Design a protein around this nucleic acid. Sequence first.
DNA 1: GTGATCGC
DNA 2: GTGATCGC
Length: 64
Amino acid sequence: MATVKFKYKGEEKQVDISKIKKVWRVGKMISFTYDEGGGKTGRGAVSEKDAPKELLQMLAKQKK
DNA sequence: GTGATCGC
DNA sequence: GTGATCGC
């Protein structure tokens, strides 16, 4: 519902957090995948520092 | 290296 | 099997 903005292979992306498929923590990094067009899966990551709460709670609720 | 994945 | 990616 809210969005996450992140920079991936140069330049900024903004994705609806409803598209996020999987999220995991790597120390202070919040890493994820997300659904795109064409049946493809995108990757992105953000600092925990100001990560959207919607995304952080997904982390705490899944199941890897 | 780290966690996980894409895209070879 | 693995190189690049992401924040650190």
